């Protein structure tokens, strides 16, 4: 999603549903291919040891002057009318200047944004309404003109414009926690395996201290651990190597 071919608009963002997977976020933080890396509520190094229920990478592009609007505790046109984030947004926002990718000769005017709306959106509420409404008491009957604006306007992503107008491929990684079980987690880094020596072991299921040595015990395909006759852990199958 960060290096996708084409992005969506700011009000019709492509919500990529991410679930039941892992990812080493330090690689993206040190990828040297981004313009902004700001995680709110949790650092990129702290979230590597945390799990989440659902992760939605909202794909869209905005101008350089509008990057500040995409953050918790910030208001604006896009922060209120096109894409509203919660006041307690615990996700992370990442962006990259795509002036060499999205902009073209004459300017890329495919990314649209609404200048207003009948009411402010809710957290993570998408709207794709292209209807032209009336401002005053004189009904315009569809088309704009005489006090009835057209909210949809195209972004001016030109290749020679200033940095405040250039495109930035903002990818709002919406991390949330719902009633469902946790599916997404960080990189489960491990250490080297030691055999035939007294070493303290720490598996995902159980922990303890003892000498890990091979034996003729045959665990079932689903059995990860084993206990003795006294219902006490005396054997364990390594999760990496069978």
């Amino acid at each position, epitope marked *: 999603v960060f290096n996708a071919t084409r992005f969506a608009s700011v009000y019709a963002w492509n919500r990529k549903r991410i679930s039941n997977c892992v990812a080493d976020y330090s690689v993206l933080y040190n990828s040297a291919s981004f313009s902004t890396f700001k995680c709110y509520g949790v650092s990129p190094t702290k979230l590597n040891d945390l799990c989440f229920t659902n992760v939605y990478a909202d794909s869209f592009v905005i101008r350089g*002057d509008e990057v500040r609007q995409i953050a918790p505790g910030q208001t604006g046109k896009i922060a209120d009318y096109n894409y509203k984030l919660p006041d307690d947004f615990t996700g992370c926002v990442i962006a990259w200047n795509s002036n060499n990718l999205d902009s073209k000769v004459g300017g890329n005017y495919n990314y649209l944004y609404r200048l207003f709306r009948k009411s402010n959106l809710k957290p993570f509420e998408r709207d794709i309404s292209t209807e032209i409404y009336q401002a005053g008491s004189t009904p315009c009957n569809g*088309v704009e*003109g005489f006090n009835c*604006y057209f909210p*949809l*306007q195209s972004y001016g992503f030109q290749p020679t414009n200033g940095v405040g107008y250039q495109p930035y491929r903002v990818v709002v990684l919406s991390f949330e926690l719902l009633h469902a079980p946790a599916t997404v987690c960080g990189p489960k880094k491990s250490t080297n395996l030691v055999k035939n020596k007294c070493v303290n072991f720490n598996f995902n299921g159980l922990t303890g201290t003892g000498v890990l040595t091979e034996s003729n015990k045959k665990f079932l395909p689903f059995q990860q651990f084993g206990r003795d006759i006294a219902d006490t852990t005396d054997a364990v199958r390594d999760p990496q190597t069978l």
Partner: antibody
Amino acid sequence: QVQLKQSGPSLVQPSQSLSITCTVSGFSLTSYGVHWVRQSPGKGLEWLGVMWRGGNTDYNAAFMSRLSITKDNSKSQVFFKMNSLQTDDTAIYYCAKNGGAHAMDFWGQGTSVTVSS
Amino acid sequence: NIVLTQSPASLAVSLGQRATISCRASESVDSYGNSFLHWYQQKPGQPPKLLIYLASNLESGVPARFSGSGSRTDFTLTIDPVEADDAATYYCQQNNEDPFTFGSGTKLEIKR
């Protein structure tokens, strides 16, 4: 990308009628309107009229009955019908793309229309 | 009637300073959530170009040095920093009441 250069008229006489052809390119004419102005005839930049997003039209209070605009989607050009032209109507005319809040984001190169017999 | 009494008539500002251009309006207001107007910049060698739509969001094509605010009737354009590319005539167009006429026109000159 957006091009709104004017052409067609060369020289008009007073008390006559002729249309200025503003060639629309770079955007859907059905999705955006086309404005029409002239380059500061005495007072500041005088707004003449605008074509709505595929509907009716609005014009200046003074040029309400004098000037008219008509769009031709088949040729991708908008015709600015002029009527009752006088010697004071000599100025450089421009057209622009209708923005979001009735704005004029992109502007054309225009053309100098001279009114003289 | 909407008498767009735009002032000043002209300016001669040096480099690195701040220029101010006011714009008055009569009607209308409270369209959807605001009552702001549009600002433009007519260079001597280029047609006008939109500066700020709704007087609170910058428009592409022009440099991002333009900003300002305004009341329901009075509006102001803040040009900061005044540079050698700001030599142009600025305008103030109505957007919520026919006719969409511009202001009187403030010609900004750069003391090069």
